[PDB]
Design an enzyme around this catalytic site. Structure first.
Site, PDB file in Angstrom:
ATOM      1  N   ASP A 142       0.751  -1.240   0.000  1.00 32.92           N
ATOM      2  CA  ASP A 142       0.000   0.000   0.000  1.00 32.92           C
ATOM      3  C   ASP A 142       0.779   1.287   0.000  1.00 32.92           C
ATOM      4  OD1 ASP A 142      -1.938   1.906   0.111  1.00 32.92           O
ATOM      5  OD2 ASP A 142      -3.264   0.613   1.189  1.00 32.92           O
ATOM      6  N   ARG A 146       0.054   9.193   0.833  1.00 30.46           N
ATOM      7  CA  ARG A 146      -0.902   9.307   1.880  1.00 30.46           C
ATOM      8  C   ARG A 146      -0.449   8.413   2.982  1.00 30.46           C
ATOM      9  NH1 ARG A 146      -4.164   4.370  -0.084  1.00 30.46           N
ATOM     10  NH2 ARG A 146      -3.545   4.921  -2.207  1.00 30.46           N
ATOM     11  N   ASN A 147       0.285   7.396   2.608  1.00 25.45           N
ATOM     12  CA  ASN A 147       0.756   6.417   3.531  1.00 25.45           C
ATOM     13  C   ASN A 147       2.108   6.707   4.078  1.00 25.45           C
ATOM     14  OD1 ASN A 147      -1.528   4.953   3.502  1.00 25.45           O
ATOM     15  ND2 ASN A 147      -0.765   3.402   2.137  1.00 25.45           N
ATOM     16  N   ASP A 160       1.347   2.450   6.589  1.00 28.21           N
ATOM     17  CA  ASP A 160       0.140   1.615   6.592  1.00 28.21           C
ATOM     18  C   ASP A 160       0.336   0.121   6.500  1.00 28.21           C
ATOM     19  OD1 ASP A 160      -2.507   1.752   7.209  1.00 28.21           O
ATOM     20  OD2 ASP A 160      -3.056   1.276   5.088  1.00 28.21           O
TER      21      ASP A 160
HETATM   22  C1  LIG Z   1      -3.013  12.378   4.316  1.00 29.64           C
HETATM   23  C2  LIG Z   1      -3.163  10.916   4.720  1.00 29.64           C
HETATM   24  C3  LIG Z   1      -4.070  10.710   5.931  1.00 29.64           C
HETATM   25  O1  LIG Z   1      -5.267  10.925   5.876  1.00 29.64           O
HETATM   26  N1  LIG Z   1      -3.455  10.253   6.993  1.00 29.64           N
HETATM   27  C4  LIG Z   1      -4.068   9.974   8.114  1.00 29.64           C
HETATM   28  C5  LIG Z   1      -5.363  10.346   8.377  1.00 29.64           C
HETATM   29  C6  LIG Z   1      -5.925  10.005   9.590  1.00 29.64           C
HETATM   30  C7  LIG Z   1      -5.204   9.303  10.527  1.00 29.64           C
HETATM   31  C8  LIG Z   1      -3.917   8.934  10.264  1.00 29.64           C
HETATM   32  O2  LIG Z   1      -3.194   8.252  11.153  1.00 29.64           O
HETATM   33  C9  LIG Z   1      -2.206   8.911  11.743  1.00 29.64           C
HETATM   34  N2  LIG Z   1      -2.062  10.211  11.643  1.00 29.64           N
HETATM   35  C10 LIG Z   1      -1.042  10.783  12.267  1.00 29.64           C
HETATM   36  N3  LIG Z   1      -0.877  12.063  12.184  1.00 29.64           N
HETATM   37  C11 LIG Z   1      -1.708  12.713  11.468  1.00 29.64           C
HETATM   38  C12 LIG Z   1      -2.358  12.143  10.431  1.00 29.64           C
HETATM   39  C13 LIG Z   1      -3.231  12.902   9.709  1.00 29.64           C
HETATM   40  C14 LIG Z   1      -3.425  14.204  10.049  1.00 29.64           C
HETATM   41  N4  LIG Z   1      -4.294  14.944   9.324  1.00 29.64           N
HETATM   42  C15 LIG Z   1      -4.984  14.309   8.223  1.00 29.64           C
HETATM   43  C16 LIG Z   1      -6.367  14.884   8.112  1.00 29.64           C
HETATM   44  N5  LIG Z   1      -6.225  16.316   8.047  1.00 29.64           N
HETATM   45  C17 LIG Z   1      -7.536  16.856   7.750  1.00 29.64           C
HETATM   46  C18 LIG Z   1      -5.865  16.735   9.377  1.00 29.64           C
HETATM   47  C19 LIG Z   1      -4.438  16.346   9.611  1.00 29.64           C
HETATM   48  C20 LIG Z   1      -2.758  14.762  11.100  1.00 29.64           C
HETATM   49  C21 LIG Z   1      -1.895  13.984  11.801  1.00 29.64           C
HETATM   50  O3  LIG Z   1      -1.212  14.435  12.824  1.00 29.64           O
HETATM   51  C22 LIG Z   1      -2.114  15.294  13.397  1.00 29.64           C
HETATM   52  N6  LIG Z   1      -0.169  10.112  12.983  1.00 29.64           N
HETATM   53  C23 LIG Z   1      -0.274   8.835  13.107  1.00 29.64           C
HETATM   54  C24 LIG Z   1      -1.305   8.217  12.482  1.00 29.64           C
HETATM   55 CL1  LIG Z   1      -1.449   6.549  12.640  1.00 29.64          CL
HETATM   56  C25 LIG Z   1      -3.360   9.272   9.060  1.00 29.64           C
END
Ligand SMILES: */C=C/C(=O)Nc1cccc(Oc2nc(Nc3ccc(N4CCN(C)CC4)cc3OC)ncc2Cl)c1
Length: 310
Positions: A142, A146-147, A160
């Site tokens: 994957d 985005r990952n 991912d």
């Molecule tokens: C761009 C790819 C994506 O959507 N990634 C993502 C979305 C939701 C949850 C995770 O897991 C995850 N995220 C983070 N840090 C992280 C991820 C995503 C964000 N966003 C994405 C959505 N926009 C609207 C707000 C910011 C922010 C993050 O840090 C705040 N860290 C670990 C994991 Cl597992 C990924």
């Protein structure tokens, strides 16, 4: 292989952490941004909690334990690590927060300040991450921007594992009966045969580079997923990113080689972007490159990678 895998799985009671906000939501589940506070140790570690939708079958559930298994067991700077799992009826996996979100998003936000040195380093890091998985006989399946999560702009990690598969000593391939897949990131064979190999990942690695070099553009924008294979056979391919010299684009192209073994290999990809890394300007042309380089943002909550070690 020879060594015992002393990766530690910690299990956390759900009261050990709280959820502040949600980053991502999907049928798959919800992933929250939150804090983890191990009892006694007083620290707050910022984390992402992924709460998964109820397991319909034992099988579905069994695969959830697989994900955690690989993730806890994988240590590399450039791949995410499971911090701990929580076994509620709907399991939750606790992972270190990547404060910046997924590179895909990041590039779109700062194309304006994104500079050559950065993009090449990112490539190298992503390639290092991926290489590690190759070392462990794992196929990601994957890879995409985005990952890729951004710890700090200078640091990124592959993220991912929902689809990750570990390979048998006698296995050089993985075959999949079914699922939901991101086509435009897949090698023609995988799309044609659901055959996955580290080399099918390399293909992805390349679509991933393209994503980053075009500052967030969509692969085969406007084209529907249906025919990606058609055009792939006919020889069509993602164009050269305006920013890109032939030398760099030429690598994206090799990745999209139809023959799996004519594609670059991660260890190679590492050394090559590592080489372009030293003289970035020569290989990526960016205009004005010379120019370029929760509850509370901080609350006695310094934590994460730091908590684990000296
Ligand atoms: C761009 C790819 C994506 O959507 N990634 C993502 C979305 C939701 C949850 C995770 O897991 C995850 N995220 C983070 N840090 C992280 C991820 C995503 C964000 N966003 C994405 C959505 N926009 C609207 C707000 C910011 C922010 C993050 O840090 C705040 N860290 C670990 C994991 Cl597992 C990924």
């Amino acid at each position: 292989g020879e060594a015992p895998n002393q990766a530690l799985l910690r299990i956390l009671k759900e009261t050990e952490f709280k959820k502040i906000k949600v980053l991502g939501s999907g049928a798959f589940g919800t992933v929250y941004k939150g804090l983890w506070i191990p009892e006694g140790e007083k620290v707050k570690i910022p984390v992402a909690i992924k709460e998964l939708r109820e397991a319909t079958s034992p099988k579905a559930n069994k695969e959830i334990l697989d994900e955690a298994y690989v993730m806890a067991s994988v240590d590399n700077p450039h791949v995410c690590r499971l911090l701990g799992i929580c076994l509620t009826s709907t399991v939750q996996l606790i992972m270190q927060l990547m404060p910046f979100g997924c590179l895909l998003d990041y590039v779109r936000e700062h194309k304006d300040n994104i500079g050559s040195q950065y993009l090449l380093n990112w490539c190298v890091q992503i390639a290092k991450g991926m290489n590690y998985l190759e070392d462990r006989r794992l196929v990601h399946r994957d890879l995409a921007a985005r990952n890729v999560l951004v710890k700090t702009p200078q640091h990124v990690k592959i993220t991912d594992f929902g689809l990750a598969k570990l390979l048998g000593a006698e296995e050089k391939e993985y075959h999949a009966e079914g699922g939901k897949v991101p086509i435009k990131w897949m090698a023609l064979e995988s799309i044609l045969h659901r055959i996955y190999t580290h080399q099918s990942d390399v293909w992805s690695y390349g679509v991933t580079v393209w994503e980053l070099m075009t500052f967030g553009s969509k692969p085969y924008d406007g084209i529907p997923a249906s025919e990606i294979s058609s055009i792939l056979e006919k020889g069509e391919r993602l164009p050269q990113p305006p920013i890109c010299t032939i030398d760099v684009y030429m690598i994206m192209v090799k990745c999209w080689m139809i023959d799996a073994d004519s594609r670059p290999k991660f260890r190679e990809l590492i050394i090559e972007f590592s080489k372009m890394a030293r003289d970035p300007q020569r290989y990526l042309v960016i205009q004005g490159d010379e120019r370029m380089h929760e509850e509370d943002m901080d609350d006695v909550v310094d934590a994460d990678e730091y908590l684990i070690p000296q």
